[PDB]
C-alpha cells in the first residue's frame, strides 16, 4: 500500500511468492495510476534471466490499475537478494501506447521525471 506521486503500488515493500494450482510460484504487483495522465511504466529486476514479468513495459490510464504477474522460470527459486524496480513517468495526453511509442518515450523523458519504486522478495 505505497502511495507515490504517480502510482500507488501494492505491495509496498515486500513481495510474497505463493504456489499456484499448477505448482508454480507467482506474485502480483498492482500499479494504480493516481494522476490524470497516462503513466508509462517499466519493470526491471536484479536477476533478468530469472523472472517472467508480465507485462514489463506498458502504460496505465488515469485512475486505472494494472496487474504485473511475476514468476521464476521453472527450476529456479526466489532468493532474498532478488529485487524489483518500478519506473514510471507521465505521458502526453495524445501519445500512443504501442511498443514503439513506449520505447521512444523512454528515450526522450528526462531523468528527473522518472519515478522509481523498489521492491524486495520475501523468502524466510
Amino acid at each position: 500500500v505505497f502511495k507515490g506521486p504517480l502510482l500507488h503500488i501494492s505491495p509496498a515493500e515486500e513481495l510474497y511468492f505463493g504456489s499456484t494450482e499448477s505448482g508454480e510460484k507467482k506474485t502480483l504487483i498492482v500499479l494504480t495510476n493516481v494522476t490524470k495522465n497516462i503513466v508509462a511504466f517499466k519493470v526491471r529486476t536484479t536477476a533478468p534471466e530469472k523472472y517472467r514479468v508480465k507485462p514489463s513495459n506498458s502504460s496505465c490510464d488515469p485512475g486505472a490499475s494494472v496487474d504485473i504477474v511475476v514468476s521464476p522460470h521453472g527450476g529456479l527459486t526466489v532468493s532474498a537478494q532478488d529485487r524489483f524496480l518500478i519506473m514510471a513517468a507521465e505521458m502526453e495526453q495524445s501519445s500512443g501506447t504501442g511498443p514503439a511509442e513506449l520505447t521512444q518515450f523512454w528515450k526522450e523523458v528526462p531523468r528527473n521525471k522518472v519515478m522509481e519504486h523498489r521492491l524486495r522478495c520475501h523468502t524466510v
Binding site: 526491471r44 529486476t45 536484479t46 533478468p48 517472467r52 514479468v53 507485462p55 514489463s56 506498458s58
Partner: peptide, 10 residues
C-alpha cells in the same frame, strides 16, 4: 544493478 527482463508489452 537493475535490468530489463525479456520484453513483454500489451
Amino acid at each position: 544493478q537493475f535490468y530489463s527482463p525479456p520484453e513483454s508489452f500489451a
